[PDB]
A paper describes a structure:
Nitrile group was the optimal substitutent on indole, especially, when the nitrile group was introduce into the 6-position of indole (compound 25), the most potent analog was identified, which was nearly 23-fold more potent than compound 19 and >1,000-fold more potent than the fragment hit resulting from virtual screening (compound 4, IC50 > 100 µM). Ligand 25 is situated in a similar position as ligand 19 in the binding pocket of [name]. The guanidine group again forms critical H-bonding interactions with the two catalytic residues Asp32 and Asp228. The substituted nitrile group forms a new hydrogen bond with Ser328, which may account for the improvement of its binding affinity. This subpocket located at the opposite of flap loop, which is under-explored in previous studies on the discovery of [name] inhibitors. The SAR study in the present work further demonstrates its value for future inhibitor design. The superimposition of structures of [name] in complex with compounds 19, 25 and the initial docked fragment are also shown.
Author numbering: -3 to 157, 170 to 310, 315 to 385
The structure:
Amino acid sequence: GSFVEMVDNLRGKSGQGYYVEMTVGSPPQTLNILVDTGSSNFAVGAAPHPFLHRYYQRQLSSTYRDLRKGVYVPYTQGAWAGELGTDLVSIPHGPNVTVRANIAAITESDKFFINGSNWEGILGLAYAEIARPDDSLEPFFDSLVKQTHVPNLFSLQLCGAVGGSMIIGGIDHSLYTGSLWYTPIRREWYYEVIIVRVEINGQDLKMDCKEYNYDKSIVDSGTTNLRLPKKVFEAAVKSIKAASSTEKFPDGFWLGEQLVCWQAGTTPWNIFPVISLYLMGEVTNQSFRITILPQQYLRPVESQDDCYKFAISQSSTGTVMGAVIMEGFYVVFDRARKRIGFAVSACHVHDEFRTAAVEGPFVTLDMEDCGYN
Ligand SMILES: CC(=O)Nc1c(Cl)cc(CNC(=N)NC(=O)Cn2ccc3ccc(C#N)cc32)cc1Cl
């Protein structure tokens, strides 16, 4: 394939984010940057911190330009503050171009950096609307498209336990099997989609699709869990408990407050159900379903023991399809045609009885009502 040099450009530790090497400034400073499809700022640590091995040094970059403007980015648990500026940016194992991009130099932070994660910055891949301080601040990818020939499209293959590929400018066919199925992007801020139905072990959850998309549903690579709206989570957990009732688990396991460990080799994946999301398709009344295995939603925590954490958690900000979902699939963010594609990942962790799947088409009536306004 012609994108061979971008294959395998992602690394990471489990549950700690996938990162790509970027070089910034001149002479080259190379940094490990978190790949996040749920945000829109390019930001790098620019001061020493206990969790950072290296960081961006602006005074050593002759091409660094100061924007004389501070930036503050709050998240749910953490936050960071820093200074805005521009510099030359490249991705060594990505497309062969260099761009002048906005960089947020992070000079202070709370619970943002992860001990041992080996990354020191974040690459926001979503649209300008959700950028701090405001929309006038062109996100990295927008800058890439404007200044260069690179087609307005990228794709992600995150392989679970860690590594994967971020293909920029195209689609690499060795990364997936079967056909690609596309769902429209509802609005360009987050990568927003519409879930029209949810099944556990082929059994329908029987809720109004409005509930599945309450607030919004997004595809977000810098989040670990599949997060479901309060009511949907409650129902889903009932159904999963019922589907795996040949075994018993403490109530805190389903809330992620407890772990269960099996002896090495013996996890009974067979007792947990497959989970299915149906997404609106590209044609009236047409949908398709993506289906994930326990190997995706039970995550290992790093002896003689294998400990697992349930990785479906409740949300107050709608559905977030994080790495739990994405590690099953090759995902194509086709920004040029306002659509997102899913195909079975050539490298998804599976066993011999069941595999992740993307199947279609299905007929779902009145899908237009499922979105929130
Ligand atoms: C240690 C850690 O969690 N670091 C971290 C942090 Cl603080 C923020 C990010 C930002 N990227 C995200 N894709 N997502 C979030 O931060 C989660 N989050 C971001 C905004 C936000 C708002 C409401 C809720 C709820 N409920 C959750 C929210 C990435 C990482 Cl790795």
